[model samples]
Target: DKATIPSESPFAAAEVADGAIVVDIAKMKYETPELHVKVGDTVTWINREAMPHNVHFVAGVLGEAALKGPMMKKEQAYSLTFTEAGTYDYHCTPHPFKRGKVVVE
Candidate 1:
């Protein structure tokens, strides 16, 4: 099966928070969708399967690279540090249905 996997829903339905917990992707929704953190905390995403994944912030946040990856293939990982106190919304480029939010204080 070479086709990209699809998600059933783009909104959160499991009430999971995208915190320190491992997202452990969708159809590919993240295992965690909401997070609370200090001004400077590192968020890491590791793809546990043979699929392409990435961390996407707001439009101007990390640039297009943010929209793509640090690409994954099971066990591979990407780490990012949030410096400002605010909320960040992100999603996967390949699977828009996969999304997450991070809250920094």
Candidate 2:
């Protein structure tokens, strides 16, 4: 898969260590709506907008794995490593319309 990030220079592309999959939050949306990764892989999200954003898993989907991330401001990041194989649908708590999915296999 293509490893792409927002063009805005908040965090340099080189700062992403470990070659983790990147999903950028910009324009009040999740840049990658659907991302696929293997178990034990890591997905890193970078906030590219001034407004805050967070990762809140959809209800009843991931059960115990349905966790939330800290609010991220511009240039801030939240990284999660998938431990199990399942589909994790998530959205920004502040903006429910901003949705995305991470499928682990």
lDDT of each: 0.57, 0.75
Which whole-number lDDT from 0 to 100 does residue 70 have in model 1?
40
Off by over 4 Å in 2: 1-15
Clashing pairs in 2: none
Taking all chains together, each candidate's TM-score versus the true structure is: 0.66, 0.78
CA lDDT of 66 in candidate 2? 50
For candidate 1, lDDT tens digit of each residue in 1-105? 101112222222233245643454534577778877677666666676677676555455444333334445556556556667777778877677788877877
Best by TM-score: 2
Q: Where is model 2 poorest over a 10-residue stretch in terms of lDDT?
A: 1-10
Worst 10 residues of 1 by lDDT: 1-10
Candidate 2 lDDT, 19-39, residue by residue in tens: 678999987579999999988
